[PDB]
Amino acid sequence: IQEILQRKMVREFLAEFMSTYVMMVFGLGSVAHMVLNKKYGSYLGVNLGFGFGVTMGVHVAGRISGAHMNAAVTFANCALGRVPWRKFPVYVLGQFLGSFLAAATIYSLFYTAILHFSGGQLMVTGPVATAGIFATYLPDHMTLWRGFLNEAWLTGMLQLCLFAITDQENNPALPGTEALVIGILVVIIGVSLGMNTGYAINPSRDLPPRIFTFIAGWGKQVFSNGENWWWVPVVAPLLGAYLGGIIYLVFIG
Amino acid sequence: IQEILQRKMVREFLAEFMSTYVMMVFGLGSVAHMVLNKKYGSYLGVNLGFGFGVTMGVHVAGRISGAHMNAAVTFANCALGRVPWRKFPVYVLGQFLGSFLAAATIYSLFYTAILHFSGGQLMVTGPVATAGIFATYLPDHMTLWRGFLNEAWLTGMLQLCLFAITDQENNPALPGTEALVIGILVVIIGVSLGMNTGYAINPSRDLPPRIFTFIAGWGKQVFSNGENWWWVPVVAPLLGAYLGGIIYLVFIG
Amino acid sequence: IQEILQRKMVREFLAEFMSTYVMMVFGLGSVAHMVLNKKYGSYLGVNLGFGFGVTMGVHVAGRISGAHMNAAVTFANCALGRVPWRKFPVYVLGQFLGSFLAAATIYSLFYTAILHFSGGQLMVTGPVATAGIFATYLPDHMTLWRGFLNEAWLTGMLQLCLFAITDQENNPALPGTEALVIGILVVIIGVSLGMNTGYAINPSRDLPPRIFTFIAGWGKQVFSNGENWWWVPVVAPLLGAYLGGIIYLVFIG
Amino acid sequence: IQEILQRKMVREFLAEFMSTYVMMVFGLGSVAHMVLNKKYGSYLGVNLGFGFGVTMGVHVAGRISGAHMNAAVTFANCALGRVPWRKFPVYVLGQFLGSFLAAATIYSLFYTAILHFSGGQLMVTGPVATAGIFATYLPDHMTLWRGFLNEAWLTGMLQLCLFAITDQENNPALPGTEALVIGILVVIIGVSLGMNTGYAINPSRDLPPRIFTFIAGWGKQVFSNGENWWWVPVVAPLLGAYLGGIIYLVFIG
Amino acid sequence: IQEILQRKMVREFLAEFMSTYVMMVFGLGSVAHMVLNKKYGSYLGVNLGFGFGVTMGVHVAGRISGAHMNAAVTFANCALGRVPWRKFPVYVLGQFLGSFLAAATIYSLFYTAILHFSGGQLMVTGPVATAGIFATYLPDHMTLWRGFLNEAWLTGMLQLCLFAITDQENNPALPGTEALVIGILVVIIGVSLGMNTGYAINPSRDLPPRIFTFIAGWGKQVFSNGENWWWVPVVAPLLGAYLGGIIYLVFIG
Amino acid sequence: IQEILQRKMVREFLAEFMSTYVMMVFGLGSVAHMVLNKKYGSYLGVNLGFGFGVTMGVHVAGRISGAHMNAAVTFANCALGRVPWRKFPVYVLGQFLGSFLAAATIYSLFYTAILHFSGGQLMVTGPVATAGIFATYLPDHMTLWRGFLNEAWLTGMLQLCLFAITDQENNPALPGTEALVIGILVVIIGVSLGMNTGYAINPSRDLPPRIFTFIAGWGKQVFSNGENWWWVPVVAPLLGAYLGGIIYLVFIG
Amino acid sequence: IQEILQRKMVREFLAEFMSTYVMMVFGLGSVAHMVLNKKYGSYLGVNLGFGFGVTMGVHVAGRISGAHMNAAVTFANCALGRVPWRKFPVYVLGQFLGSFLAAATIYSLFYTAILHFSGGQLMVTGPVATAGIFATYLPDHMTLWRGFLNEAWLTGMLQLCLFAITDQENNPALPGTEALVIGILVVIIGVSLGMNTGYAINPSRDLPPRIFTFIAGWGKQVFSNGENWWWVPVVAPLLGAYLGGIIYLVFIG
Amino acid sequence: IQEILQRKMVREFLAEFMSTYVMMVFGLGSVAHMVLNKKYGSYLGVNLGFGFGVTMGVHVAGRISGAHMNAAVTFANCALGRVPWRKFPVYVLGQFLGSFLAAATIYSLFYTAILHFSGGQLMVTGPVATAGIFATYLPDHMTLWRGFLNEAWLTGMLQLCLFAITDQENNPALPGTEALVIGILVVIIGVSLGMNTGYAINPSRDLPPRIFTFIAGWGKQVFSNGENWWWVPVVAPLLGAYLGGIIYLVFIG
């Protein structure tokens, strides 16, 4: 047991797992606060929760593995030559397990409030829908390809700013202070551009919680709602992150 | 008098007393603002008050004693070998005295507003209850063991992130800037996970103010409300903090 | 292609373009959130979006060109001898192109919400006016020369504080941390003094989006509304920035 | 003219004048936003405006004179031996002139909004009172000596935390970053303890604006309102600041 | 067919059926307006709908059968000697059939609004409960025997006032105008005493609609909700009406 | 027992008792609806309840005794020669007993709602005061003699209009329809002039319910509240009614 | 000119014209009050306006022509043998002209309010739609045949109650008082059943105002909105009125 | 004294005085309730107060003088030959004196509420204007001749319906019940058409209260507000009433 944990790959798997768990617990707690309680919840609270959960995760795993906490970010780093391809499955697996367990924790901590709010009914759509605490669903006036464009553009902006903040050659944040700046970046992505799709901008933030809600009793409407919307938050961020990274590397690097 | 204050144990006692007093005054002021006045109070204000009161306390006593300001944090540090056991009573005594005097100060500063709000009646429960300014009480839909689970998990998260932020080996905040990051951690614990129990996560934040309200005229219902809820915020945080610390030490340290 | 991008002037043009684009996308997204949706929008969100978009732009282009992102700031720097006059057209052209493309992006991302809010009508004035998402318009009780005074004074305050923050001789922010302080300065300019004119302290923030709305289908009322208000946000900031800079240089530098 | 500005006392006078002007303009702008407009104003905005105006003033005059911006802080520093007594009149005069001119500027920038809100009537008391934009007035349920206690205690807390933040021996903020921490301290003093008296905690923030409102057309009720309340915000902060400083020096220094 | 309708008992059955149908359609329409739509519904609208539906029913069947429209009123009239006992089953049967068909009509006319409001879920309890459009359910703070007392007292008041209004010996309403006065009596019974139980005060108004909701898809919780509340609105009104009638006859007649 | 109830004086006593009971039950039910529940209560409901309770009482006792239901009306009729003086005690006694029992009935029917609203505390003053359901209390900005003037003038208007409505020689309401017109008169007295004192305009409506609240557990503050306000609603209506009656008799009769 | 106005048919044409004009002016004024102004408008006001406008029209033309004011009522009376068929065109023509001129009058009286509300845009659909002041449009969740059923059933109820109120052989309203009862019937039809379609229940209330809005500048969308909804309010009321009349005649007559 | 009051002309003068006083007291009380208090006031209350004050005045003076209570109604009756011209000054003088004294009474009864609402300032325009309790003022978006048209048309409708209600040849209200119908007519004139000008429709309702406010301390702005609006409510009703009367006489009489 002691010997196994000493291996480098096991350490990196554990670092990704822990950082993703912390970030997702803070973010989903903010979303549940907003949905269930009108006095104690706000949209700004959701933005703050997700951003500074990212800050805490970066403090947890910044040096061991880079603290990607995001499958699109890992894909963009691997495809641009900065991370070897053999580390992609390990990081993605750790992020997925962390996100799934964070969804389970939020379900356990807020159980009575969910039941009191919904009247005992676990509904995907309607005035007392609660499946949106865990995953993202398409709003009323928006179509599928508009949401695809939104997800791609937001992930591209995120990747470009992430490259700018941590670039030791150009103009980085002072070492030891970059976690705060990354958290603020995520906060303002939520503040400025987060109402058209719910700004998933992360496959790990979106798919494992949807699987958990499917298992836990919300039914199969989690996948078929919004004319099969579930696959856009998995595919659009990869393309967006790659394009944003290549744009920064060509024009500013 | 000059000679006595020069001793090391007296200095550490005074440091814990002062830091706890400052933190508790800011936090309870935020809570009173929220309860008494609807124009000037908000939940985000409560989160900000507690978190950045923690920041100011860390600046006051960070070097002399470590600025625990929390009996669960002291217990976890002593039980994991980082602090000697003989310093536990001194730190806990200083924290308790500071919290009690902060409650007395908040009572003195907000007296007329409390009387005007409540109509002269000091009530634990009801539409004009004011005992929740000082201590925490179980909400309507929540049971006792759900609250126990909530307190334990929140204190565990706090301890794990505290270990991550101040770890010189892994990835700490830049020295001279860690108080801000600790304050932000407390702020987002309030934002994301603080409505199910009131997020005491601190025996020193909870018990001395309850004793003060019992003495000052709210009666014995402060102890028996919520089927004897008073002992959960004293016991659950110790277990939570120990488990979070051991988890961080094993898997990330 | 590789050779052309290596030239210094091309690099500075691209840096100004990218930083202005990032800042304007974040700011206009905040404004659209406020106007279209009442649940997800607030004035504080607008202030945060603009300020920390400025922070991200400074991280993008701080070292290559100085990250002015503001035509008045460039004019004041060139007129006070700190930047050569031959670089003025390049910087201004890059800022204008970035702002125009950011307006186009915000139009594309929020299209369905704009149509749903306005009922299909692109109106400059009225209860469902949407031209104020992109540019600034004079409020009900304010006259033209009052707005001129407001714009000049706000830009003067901005320039004086910008000189104070980045002055290595007097008392600067620690290198690697000044982007946060500049963002906070912009945030509080919005918070304290931004309701009389909309604080379009930047000509690049104001004119290219107005041109875009004229082209895209809001008509010629964008220019003639408010007794030809469009030229004040272009002229007043230059005078304000110059006066604030000269005041700081004489009395504090 | 050039020779006169080169003297040290003239430089310190100008530094205090400029820093106080900047801080007061930001703070009074926040207060006017809150009072006049319900959509664009909030209490949190007032707290943010005052705190980060303090941050900007510290950046302006931190090294030249220490950036007291507060007559009580200057009195406490001079009485504890840290500043010579001959510099007290110069600093206080500069602060008073800066505060008076900031009040005049806020009057000029918000003139039409004030007239539209009040119906043309400059009233100290009533549903359309506007004298509270500039100075502080006692609330409905509070007496004079309760307000005296509030002012003294708040100024004492401010001075103790100011000593803690800037103490190079104990545990200071990292040099180049202390302005942010001081601003956050002022923000949370506003958030937690600022509704009982309006948290003037500064004679320079209170008396010159009251004199300006007396001159500008609000009448002599600015002085006699609240059974001659005007002198408490001048006298209580001095005692509070001295006591807080001596407490910190004895027990923590 | 022509001969059968000419008989007296058939005519009285038809009169009771038609009058009950009209009254119940108006009343249940008012209740549905209140529950489903917040803009177009109010409690005063419910009171007006029930009272003046009673007025219209009295105009329909006042001379043929007396227009009881109420099983408790029929029981009290038969038990006090004013109506022969052999007419009790015919009147009660007609009233029950009319009430059942009125519930079916209200279900058909408001179908889409019910589905849109409830999200497709037919719920007896919760934030989107719709079974209360048709029948009455016990409120949160009230017990079973308190509701029994309420029903008995309200029906007694109704019967006493009905005897007073239509008494040709004492002081009746002018013939040809008594329907308006009876409607106003029902309106003010709703206005003054109708929130503790929903003021059924009519077995025919309560039981057939509950049977319809049981059949139509709300389930068996319509009968077991509120610890078997369904039988109180059937039994309490009979006793109340008898006591009120005997009191009026003894003390005023 | 069959002959004691046959006497004329016993009949008139019973008529006054029953009519007062009915009127007071409807009125106090309306007031309780307004105070306890915000959804189901309104001021217009209070006006309607009192006015049409007067209508129902007039139908109950219009011919037997005149249906005064008001001690001031009885005093004015006796003092102007229309009723013999020996009938004054009998009528007043019946009205007082009816009002007392109506207060007891309203207490019994609304018990759980009162306890749930007030938190178990029976308070005369404060945000959860419930003594105003039964009696009238002086508002915030009104003095004692202003209320005296209000009561006298309102009772004078009531008496003048009552004389006009029931005058067979001038222009009466058609016999058999005057109860509706009297009810409408009371409704509009409530609508137009009822917020300065609560428009008791009746000693029987005011004193017996106050005695009941004193007995039932609200304490002796019911009498001393508002600097001994209890005696004005007993004395002012007599003078007002006499003056209004004499004015009508002289100038219109 | 005197000779022509003395004929019978001209007299009945003028009676129908005047009564319809009065009724429509009151009703459309109520609707405009509700739509344009939130302080001065309510749904209950709309119900009252239409019902008591019907009362005033009945007083105007009750004896000369019967005061149908409704093409469906005229059709039902003619088809059941109570009115000769040769009078149908004259009555319908008078009603149509009266309704058209009432729409023109309401347009002239409320012109500035309409322009101020809509921003100068005459829109059929959207947040500032104003075509619903004059005609009826299908709500969001309702289909065409549901609205057909609603219109037919409401007109049937109206005709049955109209037959009951004015039947001299069964139980009529006292002659000279039936206009009030008819107005109350229309009021409660609005209160109970008027939100699903807008309760036109009258071709004359619906078609001429729609023609006026088409002419006056709302465009051709008045006819094609709601999937050619315009013809349902013309056809459904005839069938409903006939069925209700025949039902009353067979079963109660 | 006894002999003088016996003369016919003195009797008619006193009847007009008393009826106008009663009507105006009820109406102005309703308006004051609406303006001063938001909980206890509504627009429907204003309509009810004015209409049923008209009902009570008709009961007071219906037989002695006809109960015009309106100078336009008197002018129309005199000009159409129904009343001799020599009675015009007596009726108008009585109405004017009654209206003036009713304004004085409303001023005396609501004095403290007016002072508390306005802060001691008697203002014609602004957020705390109180001159509109007594007279009518032109709204924001309306011009002078639009208001002239509104006043003329409303008075014409009133006169036509008044002729219809009291016409013994055509179809009158049953004698003894016409006061209720006249009150309802005034109520629905307020409900449907009363927001564009305040529906004075009466010179006696408008001018004497304006004179009282000029005398009592509101100043000369009562006459010059709204570009000399005061004379329209005196002149437009006469023309409107004459035209409506002549239209009814020609086409329906």
Coordinates of C-alpha atoms in Angstrom, one line a residue, chain H:
Chain H
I1 CA -85.5 81.8 12.1
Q2 CA -88.3 79.3 11.9
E3 CA -90.2 81.4 9.3
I4 CA -87.1 81.8 7.1
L5 CA -86.3 78.1 6.9
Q6 CA -89.9 77.4 5.8
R7 CA -89.5 79.3 2.5
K8 CA -89.1 77.1 -0.6
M9 CA -85.9 78.7 -2.0
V10 CA -84.1 78.4 1.4
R11 CA -85.1 74.8 1.5
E12 CA -83.7 74.0 -1.9
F13 CA -80.5 75.9 -1.1
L14 CA -80.1 73.9 2.1
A15 CA -80.8 70.6 0.2
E16 CA -78.2 71.3 -2.4
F17 CA -75.7 72.3 0.3
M18 CA -76.2 69.2 2.4
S19 CA -76.1 66.7 -0.5
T20 CA -73.0 68.2 -2.0
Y21 CA -71.3 68.2 1.4
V22 CA -72.0 64.5 2.0
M23 CA -70.9 63.5 -1.5
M24 CA -67.7 65.5 -1.4
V25 CA -66.7 64.3 2.1
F26 CA -67.0 60.6 1.0
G27 CA -65.1 61.2 -2.3
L28 CA -62.2 63.3 -0.9
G29 CA -61.8 60.8 1.9
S30 CA -61.4 58.0 -0.6
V31 CA -58.8 60.0 -2.5
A32 CA -56.8 60.8 0.7
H33 CA -56.9 57.2 1.7
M34 CA -55.4 56.2 -1.7
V35 CA -52.7 58.9 -1.7
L36 CA -51.4 58.8 1.9
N37 CA -51.6 55.1 2.7
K38 CA -50.6 52.2 0.4
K39 CA -52.0 49.4 2.6
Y40 CA -55.5 51.0 3.1
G41 CA -56.0 52.7 -0.3
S42 CA -56.8 51.6 -3.8
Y43 CA -58.3 53.0 -7.0
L44 CA -61.4 50.9 -6.7
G45 CA -61.9 52.4 -3.2
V46 CA -61.9 55.9 -4.8
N47 CA -64.5 54.8 -7.4
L48 CA -66.7 53.3 -4.7
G49 CA -66.4 56.3 -2.4
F50 CA -67.4 58.8 -5.0
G51 CA -70.2 56.7 -6.5
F52 CA -71.9 55.7 -3.2
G53 CA -71.4 59.2 -1.8
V54 CA -73.6 60.3 -4.8
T55 CA -76.1 57.6 -3.7
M56 CA -76.3 59.0 -0.1
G57 CA -76.6 62.6 -1.4
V58 CA -79.5 61.5 -3.7
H59 CA -81.2 60.0 -0.6
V60 CA -80.7 63.3 1.2
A61 CA -82.0 65.7 -1.4
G62 CA -83.7 63.7 -4.1
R63 CA -87.3 65.0 -3.6
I64 CA -86.7 68.6 -2.4
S65 CA -84.5 69.8 -5.3
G66 CA -83.6 66.9 -7.5
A67 CA -80.1 66.4 -6.0
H68 CA -78.1 67.7 -8.9
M69 CA -74.8 68.1 -6.8
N70 CA -73.2 69.1 -10.1
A71 CA -73.1 72.5 -11.8
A72 CA -73.0 71.0 -15.3
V73 CA -76.1 68.9 -14.6
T74 CA -77.9 72.0 -13.4
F75 CA -76.8 73.9 -16.5
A76 CA -78.0 71.2 -18.8
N77 CA -81.4 70.9 -17.1
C78 CA -81.9 74.7 -17.1
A79 CA -80.9 75.0 -20.8
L80 CA -83.1 72.2 -22.0
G81 CA -86.2 73.7 -20.3
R82 CA -86.6 71.2 -17.4
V83 CA -85.6 73.7 -14.7
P84 CA -86.3 77.5 -14.6
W85 CA -83.3 79.7 -15.1
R86 CA -83.9 81.7 -11.8
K87 CA -82.9 78.6 -9.8
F88 CA -79.4 78.3 -11.3
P89 CA -77.6 80.7 -9.0
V90 CA -79.1 79.3 -5.8
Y91 CA -78.2 75.7 -6.7
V92 CA -74.7 76.6 -7.8
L93 CA -74.0 78.7 -4.7
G94 CA -75.2 75.9 -2.4
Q95 CA -73.0 73.3 -4.2
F96 CA -70.0 75.6 -4.1
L97 CA -70.3 76.2 -0.3
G98 CA -70.8 72.5 0.4
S99 CA -67.8 71.5 -1.6
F100 CA -65.6 74.2 0.1
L101 CA -66.6 73.1 3.6
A102 CA -66.1 69.4 2.7
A103 CA -62.5 70.2 1.6
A104 CA -62.0 72.0 4.9
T105 CA -63.4 69.0 6.8
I106 CA -61.1 66.6 5.0
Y107 CA -58.1 68.9 5.7
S108 CA -59.0 68.9 9.4
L109 CA -59.5 65.1 9.7
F110 CA -56.3 64.0 7.9
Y111 CA -53.9 66.7 9.1
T112 CA -51.3 64.6 10.9
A113 CA -51.2 62.0 8.1
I114 CA -50.6 64.7 5.5
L115 CA -47.8 66.2 7.5
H116 CA -46.2 62.8 8.2
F117 CA -46.4 61.8 4.5
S118 CA -45.1 65.0 3.1
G119 CA -42.4 65.8 5.7
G120 CA -44.1 69.1 6.5
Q121 CA -43.9 70.4 3.0
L122 CA -47.1 71.3 1.1
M123 CA -46.1 70.5 -2.5
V124 CA -48.1 70.7 -5.7
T125 CA -45.6 68.6 -7.7
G126 CA -43.1 65.9 -6.9
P127 CA -42.9 62.5 -5.2
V128 CA -44.6 63.8 -2.1
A129 CA -47.2 66.1 -3.7
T130 CA -50.5 66.4 -1.7
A131 CA -52.5 69.0 -3.6
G132 CA -54.1 66.2 -5.7
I133 CA -56.1 65.0 -2.8
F134 CA -58.3 68.1 -3.2
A135 CA -58.3 68.9 -7.0
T136 CA -57.3 67.4 -10.3
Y137 CA -54.0 67.9 -12.2
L138 CA -53.0 66.9 -15.7
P139 CA -50.9 63.7 -16.0
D140 CA -47.4 63.5 -17.5
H141 CA -48.1 62.4 -21.1
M142 CA -51.4 64.3 -21.7
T143 CA -51.9 67.7 -23.3
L144 CA -54.5 70.4 -22.5
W145 CA -56.9 69.8 -25.4
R146 CA -56.7 66.1 -25.0
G147 CA -57.9 66.7 -21.4
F148 CA -60.6 69.0 -22.7
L149 CA -61.9 66.3 -25.0
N150 CA -61.8 63.8 -22.2
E151 CA -63.8 66.0 -19.8
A152 CA -66.4 66.8 -22.4
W153 CA -67.0 63.2 -23.4
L154 CA -67.2 61.9 -19.9
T155 CA -69.7 64.5 -18.8
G156 CA -71.8 63.8 -22.0
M157 CA -71.9 60.1 -21.1
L158 CA -72.9 60.9 -17.5
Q159 CA -75.8 63.1 -18.6
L160 CA -77.1 60.6 -21.2
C161 CA -77.2 57.8 -18.7
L162 CA -78.7 60.1 -16.0
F163 CA -81.5 60.9 -18.5
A164 CA -82.0 57.2 -19.2
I165 CA -82.2 56.1 -15.6
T166 CA -84.8 58.6 -14.4
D167 CA -87.1 58.7 -17.5
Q168 CA -90.6 57.6 -16.4
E169 CA -91.8 57.2 -20.0
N170 CA -89.0 54.9 -21.4
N171 CA -87.6 52.4 -18.9
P172 CA -86.7 53.9 -15.5
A173 CA -85.3 52.3 -12.4
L174 CA -88.1 51.3 -10.0
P175 CA -88.9 54.3 -7.8
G176 CA -87.2 54.1 -4.5
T177 CA -84.2 52.3 -6.0
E178 CA -82.7 54.8 -8.5
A179 CA -80.1 56.2 -6.1
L180 CA -78.2 52.8 -6.2
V181 CA -78.2 52.8 -10.0
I182 CA -76.9 56.4 -10.2
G183 CA -74.2 55.5 -7.7
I184 CA -73.2 52.5 -9.8
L185 CA -73.1 54.7 -12.9
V186 CA -70.7 57.0 -11.2
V187 CA -68.6 54.1 -10.0
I188 CA -68.1 52.6 -13.5
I189 CA -67.4 56.1 -15.0
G190 CA -64.5 56.1 -12.5
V191 CA -63.5 52.5 -13.2
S192 CA -63.5 52.8 -17.0
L193 CA -62.5 56.3 -18.0
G194 CA -61.0 58.0 -15.0
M195 CA -57.2 57.9 -15.3
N196 CA -56.6 60.4 -18.2
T197 CA -57.8 63.5 -16.3
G198 CA -59.0 62.3 -12.9
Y199 CA -62.6 62.5 -14.0
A200 CA -63.7 65.7 -12.3
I201 CA -66.8 65.8 -14.6
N202 CA -68.1 68.4 -12.2
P203 CA -67.1 72.1 -11.6
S204 CA -68.3 72.0 -8.0
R205 CA -66.0 69.0 -7.3
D206 CA -63.0 70.8 -8.7
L207 CA -62.9 74.6 -8.2
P208 CA -63.9 75.2 -4.5
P209 CA -61.3 72.6 -3.3
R210 CA -58.6 74.3 -5.5
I211 CA -59.5 77.6 -3.9
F212 CA -59.2 76.0 -0.5
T213 CA -55.8 74.6 -1.2
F214 CA -54.7 78.1 -2.5
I215 CA -55.8 79.7 0.8
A216 CA -54.6 76.9 3.1
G217 CA -50.9 77.1 2.1
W218 CA -50.2 75.2 -1.1
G219 CA -49.5 78.5 -2.9
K220 CA -50.4 79.9 -6.4
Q221 CA -49.0 76.9 -8.2
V222 CA -52.4 75.2 -7.9
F223 CA -53.7 77.6 -10.7
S224 CA -50.7 77.8 -13.0
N225 CA -49.7 74.1 -12.9
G226 CA -50.2 72.3 -16.2
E227 CA -50.2 75.4 -18.4
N228 CA -53.2 76.9 -16.6
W229 CA -55.3 73.7 -16.5
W230 CA -57.7 75.0 -13.8
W231 CA -60.3 76.4 -16.2
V232 CA -60.8 73.2 -18.3
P233 CA -62.7 71.3 -15.6
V234 CA -65.1 74.3 -15.3
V235 CA -65.9 74.8 -19.0
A236 CA -65.7 71.4 -20.7
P237 CA -68.4 69.7 -18.5
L238 CA -71.0 72.2 -19.4
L239 CA -70.7 71.6 -23.1
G240 CA -70.4 67.8 -22.6
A241 CA -73.6 67.7 -20.5
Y242 CA -75.6 69.8 -22.9
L243 CA -74.6 67.7 -25.9
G244 CA -75.3 64.4 -24.2
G245 CA -78.7 65.6 -23.0
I246 CA -79.7 66.8 -26.4
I247 CA -78.5 63.6 -28.0
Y248 CA -80.6 61.5 -25.7
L249 CA -83.7 63.7 -26.1
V250 CA -83.5 63.6 -29.9
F251 CA -82.6 60.0 -30.6
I252 CA -84.1 58.0 -27.6
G253 CA -86.8 60.3 -26.2

